[PDB]
Amino acid sequence: MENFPTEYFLNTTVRLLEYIRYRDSNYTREERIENLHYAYNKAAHHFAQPRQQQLLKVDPKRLQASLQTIVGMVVYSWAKVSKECMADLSIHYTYTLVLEDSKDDPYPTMVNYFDDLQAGREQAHPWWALVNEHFPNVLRHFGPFCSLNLIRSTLDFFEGCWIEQYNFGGFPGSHDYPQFLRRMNGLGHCVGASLWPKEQFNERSLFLEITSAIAQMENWMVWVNDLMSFYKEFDDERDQISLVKNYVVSDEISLHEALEKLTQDTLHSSKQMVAVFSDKDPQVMDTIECFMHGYVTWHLCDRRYRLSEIYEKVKEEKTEDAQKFCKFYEQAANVGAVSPSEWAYPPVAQLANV
């Protein structure tokens, strides 16, 4: 065990929130609860169906916890899209999160992937069978271009998980490996492109804005998640391959140098996010800003990241960063700290049983 870079972590986090202009919004707590319940309720009913229960090998409690985590991420980050769109994206991003629970070799189920796809025969791999069957409910919210992005990113993700099963951090000297893997399973183009429902944006009219957002949001989104996750992943001997840990193994640098690298990229990405979009179409900048703020709010509130622990340790320090941090945290809490009992019910297992 090494000591956590609390000071360096608080500083980076604060700079991050300042760079993205983290601030209050009109998105109220009551509206969040309303959206959380709607999104959760439709998804829960979906995963509670016999077919879904039968083909999706997942521990019931893990499913319950995965669904609640994803519903939160979607509702808090895709703040500007309809309830239905939040619901359908919640189902999709829950399928992706759940695929990481499989240790099963994809090889045998992928031997006839293309031929079955071309012929329109159900896929051998159960996950593909469920996800492709459900996909139209996600794709109906987007134009052809954005849809293509969601389809590719998800295919990329499937290959990402396949690779993850080898718990390989890259060969020493394989500098290009880390980010290659991080893009493969980051779902960067899925997220980036799902921010533009055809009912709110015109894909052809904003093609350049959207394409640029996809390109830039891909890296901002995965790097921010890597950073916010750094605290929970620090002493987790079970989590052996992450962007930071692969930087260490592949680039042969220290965990600190690896963390610096991640920090420089994240901050620079944030800085350029604002510079590029602040003066563009107002609604495009709004969706982008609300996603960044929501995404951060979500990491701060979801127990999974345990950022509450950092808070408690530094809430009495009179340092500049410690102060700035606790403030942002408190802001997130006021609108985002919500008890699951207020929206996540009944449990999926209960609906499946009935």
Next chain:
Amino acid sequence: MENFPTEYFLNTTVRLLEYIRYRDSNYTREERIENLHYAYNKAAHHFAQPRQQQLLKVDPKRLQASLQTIVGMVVYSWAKVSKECMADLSIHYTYTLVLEDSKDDPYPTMVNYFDDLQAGREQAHPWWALVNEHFPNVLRHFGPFCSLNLIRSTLDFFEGCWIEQYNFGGFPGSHDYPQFLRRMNGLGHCVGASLWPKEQFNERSLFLEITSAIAQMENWMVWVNDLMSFYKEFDDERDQISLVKNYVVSDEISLHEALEKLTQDTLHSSKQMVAVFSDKDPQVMDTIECFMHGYVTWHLCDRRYRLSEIYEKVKEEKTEDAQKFCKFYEQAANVGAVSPSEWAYPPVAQLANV
């Protein structure tokens, strides 16, 4: 009005060839001619069929020229694969090259992409109809993992061309745009995974080296092409958007700074290629080395890049670069300089007419 940095271009090129250990091989001129003709002959017959002629909107001379360029690229770089594999890969990489020609908005033909795909209905876009129908002939040479990589990369390429139609170099400040676009249309994972036919390599036994090769080869391959083809490019502004030009517009740097960036990446990529694989499975390193050398040999010989011009105007210099350069060039010429009349016949149009 500007000047080709020649002096520097020679230096970079020489360092590149030295870094990758450019040297003679057992791959003889007669063997190349034998492969060129076999690959060309099968592809020419393919593209000459009524269905292919009818759905593939391409100027006959462009098709003839694209086919000859690709067959060369494949035969010289995938030196270790069977004749049949060279032929089928040539057909696929010719389809991709030809797609860069389309000026037609993909939007209307992609509105029902997923639903048609899921249902097994022929795609609305004629290119997809042809490429997907032919794909099995390419995929039969590979295991499920490599196949997945070819499929994804090709799907990415289709999106890449869609974006290319906007001739957009990225917003100033959108630092992540350039390489996002370059990977999108580089076919990096398609090339990198097609280097491992299941008849020569075992995808499960060499999963880690293959995955690593895909990750590293993706960047080496596109960057080397960007450097080599930087010549046939500033002269013209019909291809105004390129990695180097997008660096200029997006990063707001000078064409020279952009070129320096590309050079540092290309050399660093080459250096790491050798470091990582030189001591791994001998056969893996051989395929990787033969591809790099072949790929370079191909750029030096194919008229499309006009590197002969850089030659003539330097054969009488006395630099420690101009000298090194002409030497390598001459080496390439001895085994690669081949007259089309020796293998590319009869012309596709002739076979289509018959």
